[PDB]
Design a protein around this ligand. Sequence first.
Ligand SMILES: [Cl-]
Lengths: 222, 219
Amino acid sequence: ELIKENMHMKLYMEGTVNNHHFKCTSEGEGKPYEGTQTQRIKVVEGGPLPFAFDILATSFSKTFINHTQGIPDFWKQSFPEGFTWERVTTYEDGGVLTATQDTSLQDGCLIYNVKIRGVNFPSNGPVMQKKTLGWEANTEMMYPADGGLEGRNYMALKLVGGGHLICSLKTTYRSKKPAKNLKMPGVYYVDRRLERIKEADKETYVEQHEVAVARYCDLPSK
Amino acid sequence: ELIKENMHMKLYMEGTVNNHHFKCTSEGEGKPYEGTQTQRIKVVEGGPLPFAFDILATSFSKTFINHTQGIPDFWKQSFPEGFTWERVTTYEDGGVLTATQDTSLQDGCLIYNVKIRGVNFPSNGPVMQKKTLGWEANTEMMYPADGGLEGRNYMALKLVGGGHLICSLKTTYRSKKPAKNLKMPGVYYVDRRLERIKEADKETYVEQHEVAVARYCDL
Ligand SMILES: [Cl-]
């Protein structure tokens, strides 16, 4: 089909956090219907980043969610035109990060273009001091809003010395497909796990893996 | 164990939303270890309420969570002394609802005292116009923090005509028991479904059911 059982991706990302400009690129692959993917990510400008790579991590792929049960797949059916997404992540200590991304398809390859703008990350905070250790696994709540799809969630960023830095994510997802051709889902939930395969040179190379599964609440109902 | 396989509860609630004062009481029972419970709730002052009963729903019970896998049960282990919770719920259209709750155990019955303050609900929004149809199921993120437990989540309130009103919940769970005697859990999640069972006399009488299960992420 148009999204094959195996798909490749290339990504270009540019942004600023606080006032440090950077670019990353990446290349990877995964199994869109199995909900798995890997990306090999290089910092290509502004390295080494003077902030935790972790704050970029959720910016690097919605087509790779395993949509179980009934759930119509908003993203896989957005092709060939593809889709966009836009997010504000608000950290409880200050730090706000806006990400905006364009997903498109050329020659059976998925192309991501992401822009990042983060501000007010505290100078001696764990993000700017690179004192972080990855994200807990978690659940994005998906619900229809407008002629688009909206996601809400709280993520917990593991800290050196234990404890967590908490942030909220507010995401708006829009298709570029007419809408009349689009079977939009009801409310559902996406269980995700973000992990690293390997990293090196002060995180200027990071290989990142995601498992994502879309579901209805499995609890029984009265 | 002093939290048994079936437990009863009685609740007292007072508060004010958008300057409308109200009081509620409730009684109920459930199965703590299976994570189920029902409450039968009455508005005893200020009824009928000029705002959606739904904004009060999460303020009516943490002892009744089915803790699966490893997870140390903060709440069940908290007795006989019991615990408190306190919460800010912030609606994306302005509405802030603050709740402060005391949970006790007395004569084998669970006792809840709850106080509530709601401000800035838009006067023509779905809350003050009672256009709401209950809460989607959700998962609360639980983590150790500040000597106790904090909870984070977003909840989605169903509106007439099919849309949702989103709010964030920020909760601190404080145990009255000395922290030395508690086995503290790591990061975990609590899947909940809160379902209206019945509603009479313009939400002046409400039956409400919850099912709640603690777990880790299973992928
Ligand atoms: Cl997300």
